[PDB]
């Protein structure tokens, strides 16, 4: 069973085009294969520091920069979103059905 914290790169209406361009990071705690809680971290100068402090297990995004990939892939597994829908993607994540990004 998965017990993990996952960061998702979000626009107000959908998963964003990139980790870099998002409005906010949605921090989801998944426990006994269920979403238990959520939190918004705005993608501003402070939010960029905050996301590191969260110590997430995984990121879900559509695209990510070489720099951010280099930084986060040391510790964090980075998964590629499939379409725009965050709930569909959280489900796919839990099911083990998202692909792990190897190069941005």
Author numbering: 1 to 104
From the paper:
The hypothetical protein NP_247299.1 is the gene product of locus MJ0327 in the genomic sequence of the Methanococcus jannaschii genome. Its function is unknown, but on the basis of sequence similarity the NP_247299.1 protein has been assigned to the dinitrogenase iron–molybdenum cofactor family (PF02579). The fold topology of NP_247299.1 resembles a ribonuclease H-like motif, with a three-layer α/β/α architecture.
The crystal structure was determined to 1.7 Å resolution at 100 K using a crystal obtained at 277 K from 100 mM Tris–HCl solution pH 7.0 containing 50%(w/v) PEG 200. The NMR structure of the protein NP_247299.1 in solution at 313 K has been determined and is compared with the X-ray crystal structure, which was also solved in the Joint Center for Structural Genomics (JCSG) at 100 K and at 1.7 Å resolution. The key message is that the two structures of NP_247299.1 determined with current JCSG methodology either in solution at 313 K for NMR data collection or in a single crystal at 100 K show very close coincidence both globally and in residue-by-residue com­parisons. Relatively high displacements are observed for residues 10–15, 30–34, 44–48 and 66–75 in the crystal structure and for residues 35–39, 42–46, 52–56 and 73–75 in the NMR structure. Along the polypeptide chain, high B-value-derived displacements are noted for four segments (residues 10–15, 30–34, 44–48 and 66–74). In particular, for residues 10–15, the electron density is unambiguous and does not show any evidence of the Asp11–Val12 peptide flip indicated by the NMR data. Residues 30–34 did show some minor differences between the initial REFMAC5 model and the rebuilt phenix.refine model, but again there was no indication that the backbone adopts multiple conformations. While there is clear-cut NMR evidence for the presence of two local conformations formed by these six residues, we found no evidence for multiple conformations; the conformer with cis-Pro104 did not refine well and was pushed out of the density in each case. Moreover, the carboxy-terminus hydrogen bonds to Lys36 in the symmetry-related molecule and to two waters, which together appear to stabilize the trans conformation.
